[PDB]
Enzyme design. Structure first.
Site, PDB file in Angstrom:
ATOM      1  N   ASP A   1      -6.747  -9.421  -4.716  1.00 48.99           N
ATOM      2  CA  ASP A   1      -7.011  -8.147  -4.879  1.00 48.99           C
ATOM      3  C   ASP A   1      -7.555  -7.174  -6.094  1.00 48.99           C
ATOM      4  O   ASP A   1      -6.343  -7.441  -6.962  1.00 48.99           O
ATOM      5  CB  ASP A   1      -5.691  -7.421  -4.212  1.00 48.99           C
ATOM      6  CG  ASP A   1      -5.528  -5.938  -4.194  1.00 48.99           C
ATOM      7  OD1 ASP A   1      -6.139  -5.238  -3.770  1.00 48.99           O
ATOM      8  OD2 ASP A   1      -4.128  -5.790  -3.798  1.00 48.99           O
TER       9      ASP A   1
ATOM     10  N   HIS B   1      -6.171  -7.355  -0.845  1.00 46.59           N
ATOM     11  CA  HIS B   1      -4.726  -6.064  -0.401  1.00 46.59           C
ATOM     12  C   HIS B   1      -4.221  -6.053   0.512  1.00 46.59           C
ATOM     13  O   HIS B   1      -2.910  -5.854   0.293  1.00 46.59           O
ATOM     14  CB  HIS B   1      -5.904  -5.576  -0.637  1.00 46.59           C
ATOM     15  CG  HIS B   1      -5.162  -3.540  -0.646  1.00 46.59           C
ATOM     16  ND1 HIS B   1      -4.339  -3.679  -1.850  1.00 46.59           N
ATOM     17  CD2 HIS B   1      -5.337  -2.695  -0.034  1.00 46.59           C
ATOM     18  CE1 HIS B   1      -3.948  -2.275  -1.655  1.00 46.59           C
ATOM     19  NE2 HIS B   1      -4.119  -1.711  -0.417  1.00 46.59           N
TER      20      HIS B   1
ATOM     21  N   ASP C   1       0.891  -0.748  -0.215  1.00 44.63           N
ATOM     22  CA  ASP C   1      -0.427  -0.628  -0.001  1.00 44.63           C
ATOM     23  C   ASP C   1       0.849   1.329  -0.545  1.00 44.63           C
ATOM     24  O   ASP C   1       1.820   1.365  -0.616  1.00 44.63           O
ATOM     25  CB  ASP C   1      -1.586  -0.126   1.008  1.00 44.63           C
ATOM     26  CG  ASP C   1      -1.985   1.380  -0.287  1.00 44.63           C
ATOM     27  OD1 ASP C   1      -2.023   2.433   0.561  1.00 44.63           O
ATOM     28  OD2 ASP C   1      -3.444   0.800  -0.550  1.00 44.63           O
ATOM     29  N   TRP C   2      -0.005   2.166   0.288  1.00 43.40           N
ATOM     30  CA  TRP C   2       1.002   3.698   1.173  1.00 43.40           C
ATOM     31  C   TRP C   2       2.147   3.266   1.502  1.00 43.40           C
ATOM     32  O   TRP C   2       3.048   4.095   0.912  1.00 43.40           O
ATOM     33  CB  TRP C   2       0.013   5.005   1.402  1.00 43.40           C
ATOM     34  CG  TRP C   2      -0.754   5.269   0.567  1.00 43.40           C
ATOM     35  CD1 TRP C   2      -2.167   5.265   0.667  1.00 43.40           C
ATOM     36  CD2 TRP C   2       0.098   6.505  -0.238  1.00 43.40           C
ATOM     37  NE1 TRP C   2      -2.461   6.282  -0.167  1.00 43.40           N
ATOM     38  CE2 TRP C   2      -0.951   7.085  -1.246  1.00 43.40           C
ATOM     39  CE3 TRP C   2       1.518   7.463  -0.304  1.00 43.40           C
ATOM     40  CZ2 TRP C   2      -0.917   8.130  -2.188  1.00 43.40           C
ATOM     41  CZ3 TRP C   2       1.810   8.208  -1.320  1.00 43.40           C
ATOM     42  CH2 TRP C   2       0.058   8.877  -1.908  1.00 43.40           C
TER      43      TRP C   2
ATOM     44  N   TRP D   1     -13.187   1.257  -3.390  1.00 39.22           N
ATOM     45  CA  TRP D   1     -12.058   1.985  -1.551  1.00 39.22           C
ATOM     46  C   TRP D   1     -12.745   3.704  -1.113  1.00 39.22           C
ATOM     47  O   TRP D   1     -12.622   3.853  -0.380  1.00 39.22           O
ATOM     48  CB  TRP D   1     -10.968   0.981  -2.351  1.00 39.22           C
ATOM     49  CG  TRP D   1      -9.749   2.036  -1.600  1.00 39.22           C
ATOM     50  CD1 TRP D   1      -9.274   2.848  -1.536  1.00 39.22           C
ATOM     51  CD2 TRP D   1      -8.966   0.942  -0.744  1.00 39.22           C
ATOM     52  NE1 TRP D   1      -7.993   2.465  -0.818  1.00 39.22           N
ATOM     53  CE2 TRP D   1      -8.256   1.420   0.379  1.00 39.22           C
ATOM     54  CE3 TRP D   1      -8.930  -0.608  -0.111  1.00 39.22           C
ATOM     55  CZ2 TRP D   1      -7.160   1.381   0.923  1.00 39.22           C
ATOM     56  CZ3 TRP D   1      -8.379  -0.479   0.705  1.00 39.22           C
ATOM     57  CH2 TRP D   1      -6.867  -0.318   1.905  1.00 39.22           C
TER      58      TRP D   1
END
EC number: 3.8.1.5
Length: 310
Positions: free
Chosen positions: A260, A289, A124-125, A175
């Site tokens: 995902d 995810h 992710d981030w 999302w």
């Protein structure tokens, strides 16, 4: 400078599977008056450090089944909560969270603790910021464990990393909807939907930091930063490709969460190609995810590959 707030400590009394003691730094440079939380686990003198980066909309709690596997191996694990997340402080205004503002905080954290021998662990981030770290000071990174993530590039240069924003409508469009639109955002429901395997207790661990919506400004700005990428973020992320493709000589380990909808294969096969030396990924069929919820299996295998090539 940045008006910020802090989450009542009682919000975390009942955490499940989080026996880690908290550490804080409150003097980062550029980050005045702000207190950050981070886990420091294992032998605080080990050669190797696993710097574990979290993403949207989570915290260090995320790495909770991974951390001990890494510590028991003889590594020191760092595991910071970004400003607006977990136990760190939270600026109140979304205009304050930017790509640099969280990136510079990362570089600041790294200098301050002076980490070396890093095995970067992203998703992710955490990977979006985290994969721009290495070129900053290459001598300090040695490995990388990359889970479902990529680089925030501009459309032209890499379409795969822009494409998932628009299609499927039940992927990133969904999302972002769940995140920036509710006036009453319940991160326990959100997580139980994006990670169907969580128990009611786990899910509640991801809402603990947020008592009310005024604690959520950073929860809110992150999807929008995927959507709307500023110049610095583009330049920086563009500069990172070159580094992973030509400069990087480190060891890598990839694991893909096949369920995902945001960042599965479409996004991971193309990343695998730009990382000089990235091997055949590890496809986890029953994972979404948040790969880190099938964490132990990843942590174990990642260390098994890590030694078989040392």
């Amino acid at each position: 400078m940045i008006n910020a707030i802090r989450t009542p400590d009682q919000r975390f009394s009942n955490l499940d599977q989080y026996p880690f003691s908290p550490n804080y730094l409150d003097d980062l440079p550029g980050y005045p008056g702000l207190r950050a939380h981070y886990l420091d686990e294992g032998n605080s003198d080990a050669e190797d450090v696993f710097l574990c980066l979290h993403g949207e909309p989570t915290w260090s709690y995320l790495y909770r089944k991974m951390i001990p596997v890494f510590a028991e191996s003889g590594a020191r694990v760092i595991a910071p909560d970004f400003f607006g997340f977990g136990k760190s402080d939270k600026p109140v205004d979304e205009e304050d969270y930017t790509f640099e503002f969280h990136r510079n905080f990362l570089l600041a954290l790294i200098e301050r603790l002076d980490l070396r021998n890093i095995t970067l662990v992203v998703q992710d981030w955490g990977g979006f910021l985290g994969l721009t770290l290495p070129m900053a000071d290459p001598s300090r990174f040695k490995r990388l464990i990359i889970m479902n993530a990529c680089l925030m590039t501009d459309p032209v240069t890499q379409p795969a990393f822009s494409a998932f924003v628009t299609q499927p409508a039940d992927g990133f469009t969904a999302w972002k909807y769940d995140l920036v639109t509710p006036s009453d955002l319940r991160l326990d429901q959100f997580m139980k939907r994006w990670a169907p395997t969580l128990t009611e207790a786990e899910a509640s661990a991801y809402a603990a930091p947020f008592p009310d919506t005024s604690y959520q400004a950073g929860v809110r700005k992150f999807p929008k930063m995927v959507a709307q990428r500023d110049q610095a973020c583009i330049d920086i992320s563009t500069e990172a490709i070159s580094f992973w493709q030509n400069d990087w000589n480190g060891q890598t380990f990839m694991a893909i969460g096949m369920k995902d909808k945001l960042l599965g294969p479409d996004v991971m096969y193309p990343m695998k190609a730009l990382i000089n030396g990235c091997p055949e990924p590890l496809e986890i069929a029953d994972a979404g995810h948040f790969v880190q919820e099938f964490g132990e299996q990843v942590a174990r295998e990642a260390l098994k590959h890590f030694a078989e090539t040392e």
